[PDB]
Symmetry: C2
Subunit: 601 residues, 2 copies
């Protein structure tokens, strides 16, 4: 039945890996090992060495032996955190080796015939999974916190440390504009440890003017005067009589800034909401000018709209996905779901960043959260509706919820995410074709680097939640059908390998976010596990033997584990600690460069 999809996937990997080995060992090396030219050559060869050292395949080199500190040397701590996430999920699904050999051995109903056929073994399996996940999650969480501390205390001096973002503000002083109002206020509150302070202004007439002028200047190759005059005029205009509500404030020592940010500032929380100032390149200067009601009103309207769009996908798209010479009919709904769900990281990110989230490093996280809500209800409603439209007592319901939906769609969809997916991702075939087309067609006149050259960040906004849909669809069916357990374990293995290659050779991070997005990942893994435990409570209950009173303990255990983890480690993921603040770097920093690092245009 579904074997055609796996065959197509393995053929696609054969093709794309053939293309990789045929193309990377060539003069296209400016593309496939892209992270090395920038950050001057360290992989500018099909090795880190001379003498025709191609030897395909060449991942017996550092690709497999990538020191956990080597990666954080060659990429931000964010990359190392993502790797520990991949490794931990691989660990959970691998340490479940004493669930695939025993529980699959119990092979006219085809599944267990609703009669005591060691359903106790199923309870054993659910305990084993719910136990190994706890163990690995704890270990990994300690490890990530240790990485964050280690790279946070030895980091160089960066302008994100001497600053806070004072998001809200009582606008009127009634006789003076806002710059001197901030001056008076923070001077009263923080004497002699307070350097200077930008006041967030408007980006319209000019910010767009600067963008257009930059475009015009870029056009110069082998008019502008009016543009630069307008720039000067609107620039002088904006730095006066606009002086919006929010602002950003710089302190003279690393200790005092990290002390202020975690603090409070007026005995009515709805005014002067200081917060650890984000990194310069992700400050998101658009959403500052929002009071504390507007954030909440916007947020609840956004959640209502997310619920509405959840329904507007789950009716028609799940109907279409419940569809199942027929081989084309077997392939079609796969890519149909890929297009119906491959959109909407973008709409979620737009919608979320419109909730006033004042930093890209948090907009990405919020979009990932909303996407996880989409994913869970994808699994739930998709399988339920597929089973129902498959059928027309409860035993029939059990048979339909177990075998068809999983064994066809959930088994093969991951295969559409691995072989064809990671296969396309590693070769970077389509970036290769677009780059070469850019070279032949209209180029940037030797500004090819300032052209289709620059890789994005690893985009930990479609790679995180995208590679968690299958984590959920894996935990949920982990003991229903260990076949997807083998599929998920091989998925995360291939993902670790190919993504280590890409992180070491091609990708270049944009922001830093030293360690965040891990507690989010942890809470999300835990939520997947909790949903798994509830679903096995349900299915085993449908199997009419009452070890459900034995399964409830795991539900309580997951809730309590969440509480203890969030309270015993996840308070260190919101602030640089005062100790680390005192030991960030002490070599006489100058505030002037820092201050020049937040001028927006």
């Amino acid at each position: 039945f579904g074997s055609f999809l796996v065959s197509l996937g393995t053929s696609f990997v054969i093709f794309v890996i053939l293309m990789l080995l045929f193309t990377w060992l060539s003069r296209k090396s400016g593309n496939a090992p892209i992270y090395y030219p920038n950050r001057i050559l360290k992989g500018l060869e099909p090795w880190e060495g001379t003498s025709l050292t191609r030897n395909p395949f060449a991942w017996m080199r550092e690709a497999l032996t990538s020191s956990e500190q080597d990666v954080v040397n060659l990429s931000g701590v964010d990359t190392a955190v993502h790797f520990v996430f991949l490794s931990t999920v691989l660990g959970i699904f691998a340490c479940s080796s004493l669930l695939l050999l025993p529980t699959l051995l119990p092979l006219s109903m085809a599944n267990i015939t609703k009669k005591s056929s060691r359903l106790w073994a199923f309870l054993g399996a659910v305990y084993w999974i719910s136990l190994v996940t706890y163990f690995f999650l704890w270990k990994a969480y300690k490890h990530v916190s240790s990485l964050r501390a280690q790279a946070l205390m030895s980091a160089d001096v960066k302008p994100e440390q001497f600053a806070i973002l004072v998001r809200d503000m009582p606008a009127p002083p009634d006789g003076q504009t806002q710059k001197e109002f901030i001056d008076s206020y923070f001077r009263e509150i923080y004497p002699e440890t307070f350097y200077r302070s930008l006041v967030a202004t408007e980006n319209s007439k000019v910010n767009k003017i600067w963008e257009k002028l930059e475009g015009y200047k870029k056009k110069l190759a082998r008019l502008i005067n009016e543009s630069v005059a307008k720039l000067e005029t609107e620039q002088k205009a904006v730095l006066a009589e606009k002086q919006q509500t929010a602002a950003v404030v710089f302190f003279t020592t690393r200790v005092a800034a990290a002390s202020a940010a975690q603090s409070l500032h007026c005995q009515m929380v709805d005014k002067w909401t200081v917060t650890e100032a984000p990194e310069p390149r992700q400050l998101l200067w658009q959403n500052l000018n929002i009071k504390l009601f507007s954030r909440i009103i916007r947020q609840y309207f956004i959640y209502f709209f997310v619920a509405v769009t959840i329904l507007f996908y789950m009716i028609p798209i799940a109907f279409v996905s419940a569809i199942t010479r027929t081989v084309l009919e077997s392939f079609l709904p796969q890519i149909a779901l890929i297009v119906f769900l491959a959109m909407l990281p973008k709409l979620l990110l737009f919608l979320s960043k419109a909730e006033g989230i004042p930093s890209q490093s948090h907009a990405i996280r919020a979009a990932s959260g909303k996407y996880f809500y989409f994913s869970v209800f994808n699994v739930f409603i998709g399988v339920t509706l597929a089973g129902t439209l498959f059928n027309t007592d409860m035993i029939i319901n059990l048979l339909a919820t177990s075998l068809p939906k999983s064994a066809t769609f959930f088994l093969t969809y991951v295969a559409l995410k691995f072989f064809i997916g990671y296969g396309l991702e590693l070769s970077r075939i389509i970036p290769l074709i677009i780059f070469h087309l850019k070279k032949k067609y209209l180029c940037k006149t030797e500004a090819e680097v300032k052209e289709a050259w620059y890789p994005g960040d690893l985009s930990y906004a479609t790679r995180v939640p995208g590679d968690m849909l299958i984590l959920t669809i894996t935990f949920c069916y982990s003991v229903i059908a260990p076949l997807i357990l083998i599929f998920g374990i091989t998925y995360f293995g291939l993902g670790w390998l190919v993504l280590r290659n890409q992180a070491l050779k091609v990708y270049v991070p944009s922001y830093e976010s030293y360690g965040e997005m891990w507690p989010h990942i942890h809470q999300e893994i835990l939520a997947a596990l909790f949903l798994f435990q509830v679903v096995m409570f349900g299915y085993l209950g449908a199997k009419t033997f009452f070890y459900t009173a034995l399964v409830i303990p795991l539900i309580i255990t997951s809730l309590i584990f969440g509480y203890v983890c969030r309270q015993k480690f996840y308070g260190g993921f919101e602030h640089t600690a005062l100790e680390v603040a005192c030991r960030e770097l002490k070599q006489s920093p100058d505030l002037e460069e820092i201050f020049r690092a937040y001028i927006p245009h």
Copy 2:
């Protein structure tokens, strides 16, 4: 049912209040007005003795003319906050005026009609109640935030604006002692803005018992002869090995202390951990020892225990309490002359004898709860008291409410089995006897008016051993927020539960709260004195659970309205969403200023020549 209880009720209240108007109007005041003679003695004989004046106008007029500023100046900000609680619940129960008259007009029995059109007005009453509660909560919870800010801003040098409570030191520096480790650390972080640090002492048990024994022995009029054991043990143990994991540090200036306290201190939050130091007389040196994970373990075990308490409460403990009936007055009717049964009203008393045992348990409950919370790593007194109120409130709801109310709203649509079977009648008996406790609450407001006067006045003569006019035992306790708030919110929860199912009891709710407000404006303007001035940070809890009671009321109206069969119970779900969202917006619009002493307030105070030597001596216990 409750008719006889109210008959006891108002009669007892009248008799006791007559006793008040007799006894208070006398030269033997002493404790009757108590706060005033202690404080400044100004209110002692309030310009007329409170007696030569018209007695009903003597006390009531003074009470009814008080002001928030007056009460704050006399008592503090906290009792005035409590009055805001009483007034803002009185407002909710009162301003629902166009819900008592219009809903009584509609009044097998035709008392309620199964699928009437007239029932499409209970939903209107529920919206009116929920809306008026939203408005009053918001108004009160701006007003209290204003009070907190004003009280903080106007205060003066108090020896907790300069301290924090670092309490999870990793024990070993491995080559020296704890105190020098902590001092070296905090000098590494804060240079020139860290004054000196005090570390708790584990063997404070033995030093405190020596100090207590010495203080007792000092009562030799006919702490004064306590040299050898006290000094030897204190000094040698403080130096040698009592250094615990916890300590109190002292920063130079208020801004620095506030900024440190609101912060953290080690990128691993399982260690050095900082909370705002409580008042000198509030923090519990007995509890600073506990680490974090140990505190979590103790907390969850405690909560599991209290859940077992409610369950097995409405199970054999209270079951055999009900069994403890002691029929026909324990068969000693020859010893009893009222055996003639002309007082057949004695039947209710014989039935409440098991309810008297239940009274015993409910009177022990405030102490039983408060002990648990204090033994859970709660590093203060105010926080422990608030936690005790929370535990008592959960107990009150899942005791009085949920049994009977859920049984009605649901059914009206081995040992475990018969335990649950007997539990259902147990719930109804509990509800009836609890409303009886409410009439006992009327009697108790009167009892608060009188009794410890008699106990105290007995001491001046019965003991009369060595008092020497200095054994002043007429020392009031605080307006204890350990029994006032939870037992005064039991009335609120009952009121919302039957707000429109039996909308007659809004009159009883207003009765109770108005009487409490008046007696507590008196009985707190003249007698009570608070022991710890937490500047108002008990109101967020009162809000959370008044709203919780409102949410419970919304759910139960959904249930008991859907029991009536017509398309109701749909226009109620939006109200429940409203209550949850209102909770969220409140907690994100005011709950900040109720934790962290407001850095702006901390610095703008502009202290006039403070010191610190006269401050570290305030935190030293002995």
